[PDB]
Design an enzyme around this catalytic site. Structure first.
Site, PDB file in Angstrom:
ATOM      1  N   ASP A   1      -4.153  19.308 -50.188  1.00 40.04           N
ATOM      2  CA  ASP A   1      -4.150  18.570 -48.930  1.00 40.04           C
ATOM      3  C   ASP A   1      -3.234  17.354 -48.953  1.00 40.04           C
ATOM      4  O   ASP A   1      -3.654  16.254 -48.544  1.00 40.04           O
ATOM      5  CB  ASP A   1      -5.569  18.159 -48.543  1.00 40.04           C
ATOM      6  CG  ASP A   1      -6.327  19.269 -47.815  1.00 40.04           C
ATOM      7  OD1 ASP A   1      -6.198  19.367 -46.561  1.00 40.04           O
ATOM      8  OD2 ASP A   1      -7.064  20.017 -48.502  1.00 40.04           O
TER       9      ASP A   1
ATOM     10  N   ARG B   1      -1.459  11.654 -43.642  1.00 41.51           N
ATOM     11  CA  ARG B   1      -2.808  11.383 -43.134  1.00 41.51           C
ATOM     12  C   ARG B   1      -3.819  11.044 -44.241  1.00 41.51           C
ATOM     13  O   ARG B   1      -4.901  10.527 -43.961  1.00 41.51           O
ATOM     14  CB  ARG B   1      -3.336  12.586 -42.309  1.00 41.51           C
ATOM     15  CG  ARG B   1      -3.615  13.868 -43.114  1.00 41.51           C
ATOM     16  CD  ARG B   1      -4.192  15.034 -42.289  1.00 41.51           C
ATOM     17  NE  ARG B   1      -4.599  16.145 -43.167  1.00 41.51           N
ATOM     18  CZ  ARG B   1      -3.885  17.250 -43.377  1.00 41.51           C
ATOM     19  NH1 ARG B   1      -2.729  17.425 -42.745  1.00 41.51           N
ATOM     20  NH2 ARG B   1      -4.332  18.183 -44.219  1.00 41.51           N
ATOM     21  N   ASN B   2      -3.477  11.387 -45.488  1.00 42.47           N
ATOM     22  CA  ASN B   2      -4.387  11.250 -46.624  1.00 42.47           C
ATOM     23  C   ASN B   2      -3.932  10.194 -47.600  1.00 42.47           C
ATOM     24  O   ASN B   2      -4.549  10.030 -48.612  1.00 42.47           O
ATOM     25  CB  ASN B   2      -4.542  12.589 -47.376  1.00 42.47           C
ATOM     26  CG  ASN B   2      -5.251  13.620 -46.559  1.00 42.47           C
ATOM     27  OD1 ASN B   2      -6.161  13.303 -45.776  1.00 42.47           O
ATOM     28  ND2 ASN B   2      -4.835  14.875 -46.706  1.00 42.47           N
TER      29      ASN B   2
ATOM     30  N   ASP C   1      -9.426   9.651 -51.189  1.00 39.91           N
ATOM     31  CA  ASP C   1     -10.480  10.489 -51.735  1.00 39.91           C
ATOM     32  C   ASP C   1     -10.147  11.974 -51.543  1.00 39.91           C
ATOM     33  O   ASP C   1      -9.629  12.376 -50.499  1.00 39.91           O
ATOM     34  CB  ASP C   1     -11.801  10.146 -51.070  1.00 39.91           C
ATOM     35  CG  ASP C   1     -12.956  10.853 -51.701  1.00 39.91           C
ATOM     36  OD1 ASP C   1     -13.315  10.490 -52.839  1.00 39.91           O
ATOM     37  OD2 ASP C   1     -13.528  11.754 -51.062  1.00 39.91           O
TER      38      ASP C   1
HETATM   39  C1  LIG Z   1      -8.072  10.756 -47.611  1.00 40.58           C
HETATM   40  N1  LIG Z   1      -8.801   9.854 -46.668  1.00 40.58           N
HETATM   41  C2  LIG Z   1      -9.747   9.044 -47.181  1.00 40.58           C
HETATM   42  O1  LIG Z   1      -9.934   8.897 -48.404  1.00 40.58           O
HETATM   43  C3  LIG Z   1     -10.476   8.175 -46.133  1.00 40.58           C
HETATM   44  C4  LIG Z   1     -10.542   8.667 -44.825  1.00 40.58           C
HETATM   45  C5  LIG Z   1     -11.157   7.899 -43.826  1.00 40.58           C
HETATM   46  C6  LIG Z   1     -11.727   6.646 -44.122  1.00 40.58           C
HETATM   47  C7  LIG Z   1     -11.651   6.149 -45.408  1.00 40.58           C
HETATM   48  C8  LIG Z   1     -11.005   6.901 -46.406  1.00 40.58           C
HETATM   49  N2  LIG Z   1     -10.981   6.389 -47.645  1.00 40.58           N
HETATM   50  C9  LIG Z   1     -10.597   5.156 -47.979  1.00 40.58           C
HETATM   51  N3  LIG Z   1     -10.546   4.852 -49.275  1.00 40.58           N
HETATM   52  C10 LIG Z   1     -10.106   3.639 -49.656  1.00 40.58           C
HETATM   53  N4  LIG Z   1      -9.721   2.745 -48.740  1.00 40.58           N
HETATM   54  C11 LIG Z   1      -9.777   3.042 -47.414  1.00 40.58           C
HETATM   55  N5  LIG Z   1      -9.385   2.110 -46.511  1.00 40.58           N
HETATM   56  C12 LIG Z   1      -9.345   2.216 -45.159  1.00 40.58           C
HETATM   57  C13 LIG Z   1      -9.099   3.400 -44.485  1.00 40.58           C
HETATM   58  C14 LIG Z   1      -9.062   3.447 -43.088  1.00 40.58           C
HETATM   59  C15 LIG Z   1      -9.248   2.277 -42.339  1.00 40.58           C
HETATM   60  N6  LIG Z   1      -9.234   2.349 -40.884  1.00 40.58           N
HETATM   61  C16 LIG Z   1      -9.664   1.133 -40.130  1.00 40.58           C
HETATM   62  C17 LIG Z   1      -9.475   1.258 -38.607  1.00 40.58           C
HETATM   63  O2  LIG Z   1      -9.622   2.652 -38.136  1.00 40.58           O
HETATM   64  C18 LIG Z   1      -8.763   3.619 -38.714  1.00 40.58           C
HETATM   65  C19 LIG Z   1      -8.954   3.662 -40.244  1.00 40.58           C
HETATM   66  C20 LIG Z   1      -9.509   1.071 -43.013  1.00 40.58           C
HETATM   67  C21 LIG Z   1      -9.550   1.058 -44.419  1.00 40.58           C
HETATM   68  O3  LIG Z   1      -9.763  -0.074 -45.117  1.00 40.58           O
HETATM   69  C22 LIG Z   1     -10.044  -1.217 -44.160  1.00 40.58           C
HETATM   70  N7  LIG Z   1     -10.223   4.247 -47.050  1.00 40.58           N
END
Ligand SMILES: CNC(=O)c1ccccc1Nc1ncnc(Nc2ccc(N3CCOCC3)cc2OC)n1
Length: 260
Positions: free
Chosen positions: A134, A138-139, A152
């Protein structure tokens, strides 16, 4: 390492998304005499359901085996109801949004930096015979302006992402490092386009037809020829004619240095 974390060490902040098992939150991990550490928190609504808990926590176990600066790290787990997985937070969020907003403030050097860092992560995965399946902008998450990370592996799953997938993955369900190399090529394209999606307005079905005819995503504006060349190499129909992530790392290094 004991991965179990006391619930009271975690303060749950805002929902930042969702996956198969439930909501993902940002929050904080607190510990005596330490600064509060920012974290991502995966939740499982209706965990236990015992079979559900098993596959949820398997997501933590997958991340646990990996140790790389450009792959998000597992912090720990809370294995009593409600079950949570605690991950490293990348505070600037998703790459695509980041690239769209910071476009007129990012230079070409930074964009190549991101593809380079990621390739080092993927060279790491390949050397552990691990197949992601994947890989896609987007990831990817943004830890700092000069630091991206694969997110993740559990939350990365699901779209069949036809527009990112190698032909042998779509036709015959074969997923190798070579098909990973295809998807990375797309991911670099997305990066150079500042977060525009591949094959916009093209139906998924039309997409396989086009690739078999030899069509490929065009060279982005202000993409250096050698970089686009490296990209097209990732999209060789023949899986064994594509470079390995080891090679990609090496070539991107020199392309990056050139651009600085
Ligand atoms: C592969 N995607 C993922 O791992 C993942 C998907 C959606 C949400 C969180 C995920 N994992 C993740 N880990 C480590 N840090 C983060 N940070 C992060 C991700 C999205 C946001 N957003 C905030 C506002 O809305 C859209 C997404 C904020 C974050 O930190 C403030 N996210």
């Amino acid at each position: 390492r004991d991965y179990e974390i006391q619930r009271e060490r975690i303060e749950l902040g805002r929902c930042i998304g969702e996956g198969q098992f439930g909501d993902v939150h940002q929050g904080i991990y607190m510990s005596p005499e330490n600064p509060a550490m920012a974290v991502a928190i995966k939740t499982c609504k209706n965990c236990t359901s015992d079979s559900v808990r098993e596959k949820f926590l398997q997501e933590a176990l997958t991340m646990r085996q990996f140790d790389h600066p450009h792959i998000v790290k597992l912090i720990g787990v809370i294995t009593e109801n409600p079950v949570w997985i605690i991950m490293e937070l990348c505070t600037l969020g998703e790459l695509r949004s980041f690239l769209q907003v910071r476009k007129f403030s990012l230079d070409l050097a930074s964009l190549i930096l991101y593809a380079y860092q990621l390739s080092t992560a993927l060279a790491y995965l390949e050397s552990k015979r691990f197949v992601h399946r994947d890989i896609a902008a987007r990831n990817v998450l943004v830890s700092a302006t000069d630091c991206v990370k694969l997110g993740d592996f559990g939350l990365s799953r699901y779209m069949l992402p036809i527009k990112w997938m190698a032909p042998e993955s779509i036709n015959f369900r074969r997923f190798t490092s070579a098909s990973d190399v295809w998807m990375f090529g797309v991911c670099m394209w997305e990066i150079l386009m500042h977060g525009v999606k591949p094959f916009q307005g093209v139906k998924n079905n039309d997409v396989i037809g086009r690739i078999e005819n030899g069509e490929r995503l065009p060279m982005p504006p202000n993409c250096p020829p050698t970089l686009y060349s490296l990209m097209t190499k990732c999209w060789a129909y023949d899986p064994s004619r594509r470079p390995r992530f080891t090679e990609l790392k090496a070539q991107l290094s020199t392309i990056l240095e050139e651009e600085k």
